[PDB]
Nucleic acid binder design. Structure first.
Ligand SMILES: [K+]
Ligand SMILES: [K+]
Ligand SMILES: [K+]
Ligand SMILES: [K+]
Ligand SMILES: [K+]
Ligand SMILES: [Mg+2]
Ligand SMILES: [Mg+2]
Ligand SMILES: [Mg+2]
Ligand SMILES: [Mg+2]
Ligand SMILES: [Mg+2]
Ligand SMILES: [Mg+2]
Ligand SMILES: [Mg+2]
Ligand SMILES: [Mg+2]
Ligand SMILES: [Mg+2]
Ligand SMILES: [Mg+2]
Ligand SMILES: [Mg+2]
Ligand SMILES: [Mg+2]
Ligand SMILES: [Mg+2]
Length: 95
RNA sequence: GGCCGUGUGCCUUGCGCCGGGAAACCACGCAAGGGAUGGUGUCAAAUUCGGCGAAACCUAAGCGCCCGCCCGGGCGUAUGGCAACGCCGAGCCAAGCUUCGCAGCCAUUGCACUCCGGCUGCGAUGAAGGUGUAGAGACUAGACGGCACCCACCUAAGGCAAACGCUAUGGUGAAGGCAUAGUCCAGGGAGUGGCGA
RNA sequence: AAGCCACACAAACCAGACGGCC
Protein backbone atom coordinates (compact mmCIF):
# COMPACT_ATOMS: atom_id res chain seq x y z
CA UNK A 1 0.00 0.00 0.00
CA UNK A 2 2.21 2.86 1.30
CA UNK A 3 5.22 3.53 3.55
CA UNK A 4 6.74 6.84 4.74
CA UNK A 5 8.16 9.46 2.31
CA UNK A 6 11.69 9.03 0.89
CA UNK A 7 13.70 10.35 -2.10
CA UNK A 8 14.07 6.84 -3.57
CA UNK A 9 11.17 4.52 -4.45
CA UNK A 10 11.02 0.72 -4.29
CA UNK A 11 9.51 -0.76 -7.46
CA UNK A 12 8.74 -4.49 -7.62
CA UNK A 13 6.61 -7.04 -9.54
CA UNK A 14 8.50 -5.95 -12.66
CA UNK A 15 9.10 -8.21 -15.64
CA UNK A 16 11.99 -10.42 -14.50
CA UNK A 17 12.93 -11.38 -18.08
CA UNK A 18 14.06 -7.91 -19.29
CA UNK A 19 17.82 -7.31 -19.14
CA UNK A 20 19.57 -5.13 -16.52
CA UNK A 21 20.87 -2.33 -18.78
CA UNK A 22 17.65 -2.29 -20.85
CA UNK A 23 15.24 -1.85 -17.92
CA UNK A 24 17.14 1.24 -16.70
CA UNK A 25 16.37 2.96 -20.03
CA UNK A 26 12.67 2.12 -19.64
CA UNK A 27 12.84 3.63 -16.13
CA UNK A 28 14.99 6.78 -16.44
CA UNK A 29 12.82 8.00 -19.33
CA UNK A 30 9.35 7.00 -18.09
CA UNK A 31 9.82 8.48 -14.58
CA UNK A 32 11.56 11.77 -15.55
CA UNK A 33 8.22 13.39 -16.48
CA UNK A 34 7.94 14.38 -12.80
CA UNK A 35 11.33 15.98 -12.21
CA UNK A 36 15.08 15.40 -12.22
CA UNK A 37 16.35 11.82 -11.79
CA UNK A 38 19.53 10.61 -10.08
CA UNK A 39 20.58 6.93 -10.30
CA UNK A 40 18.67 3.66 -10.81
CA UNK A 41 19.76 0.40 -9.14
CA UNK A 42 18.72 -2.87 -10.79
CA UNK A 43 20.09 -6.30 -9.93
CA UNK A 44 19.17 -9.67 -11.44
CA UNK A 45 20.05 -11.80 -8.39
CA UNK A 46 17.55 -14.34 -7.04
CA UNK A 47 16.82 -11.77 -4.32
CA UNK A 48 16.88 -8.54 -6.36
CA UNK A 49 15.27 -9.64 -9.65
CA UNK A 50 12.02 -7.93 -10.63
CA UNK A 51 12.96 -5.05 -8.33
CA UNK A 52 14.39 -1.59 -9.00
CA UNK A 53 15.28 1.51 -6.99
CA UNK A 54 14.72 4.88 -8.68
CA UNK A 55 16.35 7.93 -7.06
CA UNK A 56 14.86 11.40 -7.60
CA UNK A 57 16.41 14.80 -6.83
CA UNK A 58 13.42 15.76 -4.66
CA UNK A 59 10.35 14.30 -2.92
CA UNK A 60 8.23 16.35 -5.36
CA UNK A 61 9.41 14.19 -8.28
CA UNK A 62 8.83 11.09 -6.12
CA UNK A 63 5.44 11.79 -4.48
CA UNK A 64 3.77 12.51 -7.83
CA UNK A 65 5.42 9.45 -9.36
CA UNK A 66 4.16 7.06 -6.66
CA UNK A 67 0.58 8.24 -7.30
CA UNK A 68 0.52 8.87 -11.06
CA UNK A 69 2.47 5.65 -11.67
CA UNK A 70 0.99 3.19 -9.15
CA UNK A 71 -0.31 0.12 -10.98
CA UNK A 72 0.95 1.46 -14.34
CA UNK A 73 1.03 -1.68 -16.54
CA UNK A 74 4.71 -2.28 -17.32
CA UNK A 75 5.44 -5.12 -19.75
CA UNK A 76 2.07 -6.77 -19.00
CA UNK A 77 2.69 -6.46 -15.24
CA UNK A 78 1.05 -4.29 -12.53
CA UNK A 79 4.13 -2.27 -11.50
CA UNK A 80 3.96 -2.04 -7.69
CA UNK A 81 5.69 0.91 -6.00
CA UNK A 82 6.52 1.71 -2.38
CA UNK A 83 8.60 4.31 -0.55
CA UNK A 84 12.15 3.21 0.34
CA UNK A 85 12.29 1.53 3.76
CA UNK A 86 15.84 2.88 4.25
CA UNK A 87 17.72 5.93 2.92
CA UNK A 88 19.86 5.32 -0.16
CA UNK A 89 23.67 5.43 0.05
CA UNK A 90 23.74 8.12 -2.66
CA UNK A 91 21.63 10.61 -0.67
CA UNK A 92 23.06 9.81 2.79
CA UNK A 93 26.42 11.01 1.41
CA UNK A 94 25.00 14.56 1.42
CA UNK A 95 22.74 14.74 4.49
C1' G B 1 61.80 -63.32 -32.35
C1' G B 2 66.29 -64.69 -28.89
C1' C B 3 70.13 -63.78 -25.84
C1' C B 4 75.12 -60.16 -24.39
C1' G B 5 76.47 -55.30 -23.57
C1' U B 6 76.31 -49.41 -23.69
C1' G B 7 73.79 -44.81 -22.67
C1' U B 8 69.53 -42.14 -21.12
C1' G B 9 64.88 -42.58 -18.47
C1' C B 10 62.07 -45.03 -14.54
C1' C B 11 60.88 -46.97 -9.81
C1' U B 12 62.64 -49.50 -5.40
C1' U B 13 66.54 -49.53 -1.72
C1' G B 14 70.36 -47.16 1.03
C1' C B 15 73.14 -42.62 1.92
C1' G B 16 73.28 -37.18 1.68
C1' C B 17 70.30 -32.41 1.78
C1' C B 18 69.21 -24.29 1.61
C1' G B 19 63.70 -27.09 0.34
C1' G B 20 57.40 -27.52 0.03
C1' G B 21 54.18 -30.15 3.61
C1' A B 22 50.45 -30.50 9.75
C1' A B 23 51.84 -35.77 8.70
C1' A B 24 51.99 -39.17 5.12
C1' C B 25 54.27 -37.91 1.13
C1' C B 26 56.51 -35.29 -2.56
C1' A B 27 61.05 -32.40 -4.16
C1' C B 28 66.61 -32.43 -4.76
C1' G B 29 71.79 -34.89 -5.17
C1' C B 30 74.20 -39.36 -5.64
C1' A B 31 75.39 -44.98 -5.56
C1' A B 32 73.49 -49.87 -6.36
C1' G B 33 69.25 -53.65 -8.09
C1' G B 34 65.71 -54.71 -11.57
C1' G B 35 61.40 -58.27 -7.08
C1' A B 36 56.37 -55.02 -7.03
C1' U B 37 53.34 -50.71 -9.98
C1' G B 38 44.75 -51.97 -8.54
C1' G B 39 39.80 -51.45 -10.86
C1' U B 40 35.27 -49.23 -13.72
C1' G B 41 33.38 -45.48 -16.74
C1' U B 42 34.12 -41.10 -19.99
C1' C B 43 36.89 -37.64 -24.01
C1' A B 44 39.51 -38.35 -29.02
C1' A B 45 39.81 -32.76 -30.33
C1' A B 46 44.00 -29.53 -31.45
C1' U B 47 47.29 -32.23 -34.19
C1' U B 48 50.69 -25.36 -36.42
C1' C B 49 54.96 -21.83 -36.82
C1' G B 50 59.96 -21.25 -34.83
C1' G B 51 64.22 -22.02 -31.30
C1' C B 52 67.67 -24.12 -27.53
C1' G B 53 70.05 -28.77 -25.35
C1' A B 54 71.83 -33.58 -25.67
C1' A B 55 74.55 -39.21 -23.72
C1' A B 56 76.14 -43.85 -25.65
C1' C B 57 77.36 -45.20 -30.54
C1' C B 58 79.71 -43.59 -35.81
C1' U B 59 83.74 -40.92 -38.03
C1' A B 60 88.65 -38.21 -37.71
C1' A B 61 89.25 -32.38 -41.13
C1' G B 62 92.48 -29.73 -37.92
C1' C B 63 95.85 -30.32 -33.88
C1' G B 64 99.39 -33.05 -30.77
C1' C B 65 102.61 -37.24 -30.76
C1' C B 66 105.16 -41.01 -33.59
C1' C B 67 107.19 -43.70 -38.22
C1' G B 68 114.51 -39.38 -38.18
C1' C B 69 112.85 -35.04 -42.89
C1' C B 70 109.30 -35.89 -48.29
C1' C B 71 105.32 -39.14 -49.90
C1' G B 72 102.52 -41.86 -47.58
C1' G B 73 101.25 -43.81 -42.99
C1' G B 74 100.23 -44.99 -37.80
C1' C B 75 98.00 -43.53 -32.55
C1' G B 76 94.95 -39.98 -29.86
C1' U B 77 91.11 -36.67 -29.84
C1' A B 78 85.10 -34.19 -31.70
C1' U B 79 85.10 -28.71 -32.85
C1' G B 80 81.88 -33.20 -37.76
C1' G B 81 77.77 -36.53 -37.14
C1' C B 82 73.32 -40.28 -35.88
C1' A B 83 70.37 -39.91 -32.02
C1' A B 84 67.63 -42.02 -26.99
C1' C B 85 65.56 -38.14 -25.33
C1' G B 86 65.38 -32.64 -21.55
C1' C B 87 63.11 -28.37 -23.09
C1' C B 88 61.53 -22.90 -24.39
C1' G B 89 58.55 -18.48 -27.53
C1' A B 90 53.66 -18.12 -30.09
C1' G B 91 49.50 -20.32 -31.86
C1' C B 92 45.76 -24.11 -31.28
C1' C B 93 42.56 -28.03 -28.52
C1' A B 94 37.91 -32.91 -26.77
C1' A B 95 35.61 -34.06 -22.43
C1' G B 96 36.05 -32.00 -16.99
C1' C B 97 36.59 -28.35 -13.82
C1' U B 98 37.28 -21.34 -12.92
C1' U B 99 34.64 -17.06 -14.45
C1' C B 100 31.69 -14.28 -17.77
C1' G B 101 27.62 -14.04 -22.66
C1' C B 102 22.78 -16.02 -25.32
C1' A B 103 18.48 -19.44 -25.15
C1' G B 104 15.11 -22.66 -22.29
C1' C B 105 13.00 -25.09 -17.94
C1' C B 106 12.75 -25.09 -12.66
C1' A B 107 11.85 -22.63 -8.74
C1' U B 108 11.81 -16.65 -6.69
C1' U B 109 6.78 -11.63 -4.94
C1' G B 110 12.09 -10.62 -3.14
C1' C B 111 14.55 -3.55 0.32
C1' A B 112 19.29 -3.02 -2.32
C1' C B 113 22.97 0.05 -2.14
C1' U B 114 30.82 -4.46 -3.72
C1' C B 115 30.00 -9.07 -6.87
C1' C B 116 26.91 -13.20 -7.30
C1' G B 117 20.19 -19.30 -7.30
C1' G B 118 20.28 -24.16 -9.72
C1' C B 119 20.74 -27.60 -14.14
C1' U B 120 20.61 -28.35 -19.46
C1' G B 121 21.96 -26.26 -25.18
C1' C B 122 25.93 -23.63 -28.14
C1' G B 123 29.61 -18.65 -27.59
C1' A B 124 34.07 -17.00 -25.32
C1' U B 125 37.56 -17.06 -21.44
C1' G B 126 41.20 -18.86 -17.09
C1' A B 127 44.22 -22.80 -14.43
C1' A B 128 45.82 -27.87 -15.72
C1' G B 129 47.19 -31.44 -19.38
C1' G B 130 48.03 -31.88 -24.31
C1' U B 131 49.72 -30.44 -29.05
C1' G B 132 54.84 -28.72 -31.03
C1' U B 133 58.53 -33.65 -30.17
C1' A B 134 57.38 -40.61 -35.41
C1' G B 135 61.38 -43.60 -39.63
C1' A B 136 59.17 -38.00 -44.10
C1' G B 137 54.83 -38.68 -42.66
C1' A B 138 48.83 -40.60 -43.53
C1' C B 139 44.55 -42.59 -41.01
C1' U B 140 42.22 -45.87 -37.03
C1' A B 141 41.59 -46.94 -31.86
C1' G B 142 42.93 -47.03 -27.08
C1' A B 143 46.09 -46.50 -22.76
C1' C B 144 50.78 -45.58 -19.98
C1' G B 145 47.29 -39.97 -21.65
C1' G B 146 42.97 -35.96 -19.93
C1' C B 147 38.65 -36.42 -16.94
C1' A B 148 35.03 -38.68 -13.28
C1' C B 149 34.17 -42.59 -9.85
C1' C B 150 35.50 -47.04 -7.01
C1' C B 151 39.14 -50.01 -4.34
C1' A B 152 44.01 -51.16 -1.10
C1' C B 153 47.32 -48.84 1.84
C1' C B 154 49.83 -44.57 4.69
C1' U B 155 48.66 -40.05 7.15
C1' A B 156 45.22 -37.10 10.26
C1' A B 157 45.77 -30.62 9.40
C1' G B 158 40.94 -29.39 9.76
C1' G B 159 35.97 -31.10 11.09
C1' C B 160 33.90 -34.61 14.70
C1' A B 161 34.70 -36.80 19.96
C1' A B 162 34.25 -36.08 27.32
C1' A B 163 37.34 -39.61 25.72
C1' C B 164 40.65 -45.12 23.44
C1' G B 165 39.95 -42.43 18.95
C1' C B 166 36.95 -41.21 14.08
C1' U B 167 37.19 -39.62 9.43
C1' A B 168 40.40 -37.39 2.93
C1' U B 169 38.73 -32.37 1.22
C1' G B 170 46.22 -34.90 1.82
C1' G B 171 49.15 -38.66 -0.06
C1' U B 172 51.19 -43.73 -2.41
C1' G B 173 49.53 -47.76 -6.49
C1' A B 174 56.88 -46.34 -12.09
C1' A B 175 58.51 -44.47 -16.59
C1' G B 176 57.11 -45.86 -22.07
C1' G B 177 52.81 -42.91 -26.29
C1' C B 178 59.50 -37.71 -28.94
C1' A B 179 53.98 -42.73 -32.78
C1' U B 180 51.83 -47.26 -27.94
C1' A B 181 48.86 -51.17 -30.25
C1' G B 182 47.23 -51.27 -35.70
C1' U B 183 46.68 -50.50 -41.24
C1' C B 184 49.63 -47.62 -44.68
C1' C B 185 53.47 -45.45 -46.64
C1' A B 186 58.83 -43.37 -46.96
C1' G B 187 63.90 -45.88 -45.40
C1' G B 188 67.42 -50.04 -45.26
C1' G B 189 67.51 -54.64 -48.02
C1' A B 190 69.43 -53.28 -53.17
C1' G B 191 70.72 -47.75 -58.05
C1' U B 192 73.14 -43.32 -59.89
C1' G B 193 74.88 -38.66 -58.88
C1' G B 194 76.02 -34.18 -55.61
C1' C B 195 77.86 -31.80 -51.06
C1' G B 196 81.65 -33.74 -47.19
C1' A B 197 88.11 -35.07 -45.43
C1' A C 1 85.22 -39.71 -43.53
C1' A C 2 80.56 -40.36 -40.73
C1' G C 3 76.60 -38.62 -42.48
C1' C C 4 73.21 -35.57 -45.27
C1' C C 5 70.42 -34.07 -49.93
C1' A C 6 68.24 -35.23 -54.96
C1' C C 7 65.92 -38.10 -58.58
C1' A C 8 65.75 -44.34 -59.55
C1' C C 9 63.80 -48.86 -57.56
C1' A C 10 63.71 -56.19 -57.13
C1' A C 11 61.75 -59.49 -52.75
C1' A C 12 61.12 -61.62 -48.16
C1' C C 13 62.71 -59.46 -44.10
C1' C C 14 64.65 -55.43 -40.66
C1' A C 15 63.47 -50.62 -39.25
C1' G C 16 59.78 -45.21 -34.60
C1' A C 17 67.46 -45.91 -28.65
C1' C C 18 72.46 -47.56 -29.66
C1' G C 19 76.62 -51.44 -30.46
C1' G C 20 77.30 -57.05 -30.79
C1' C C 21 76.23 -62.09 -31.82
C1' C C 22 72.46 -65.41 -33.40
K1 LIG D 1 69.30 -50.73 -21.34
K1 LIG E 1 61.50 -30.70 5.09
K1 LIG F 1 55.16 -35.90 -27.37
K1 LIG G 1 42.93 -34.21 13.55
K1 LIG H 1 62.00 -41.63 -33.03
MG1 LIG I 1 60.68 -55.92 -12.68
MG1 LIG J 1 41.06 -38.08 -35.76
MG1 LIG K 1 52.75 -34.27 -35.80
MG1 LIG L 1 98.06 -36.10 -39.88
MG1 LIG M 1 103.66 -34.88 -44.12
MG1 LIG N 1 85.88 -43.24 -29.33
MG1 LIG O 1 79.49 -34.00 -29.83
MG1 LIG P 1 59.83 -28.36 -33.81
MG1 LIG Q 1 57.54 -44.86 -2.63
MG1 LIG R 1 51.69 -37.65 -27.72
MG1 LIG S 1 60.48 -43.75 -28.67
MG1 LIG T 1 54.41 -48.27 -33.49
MG1 LIG U 1 70.54 -46.56 -50.03
Amino acid sequence: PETRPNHTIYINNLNEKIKKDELKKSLHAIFSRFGQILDILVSRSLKMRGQAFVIFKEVSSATNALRSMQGFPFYDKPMRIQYAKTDSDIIAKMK
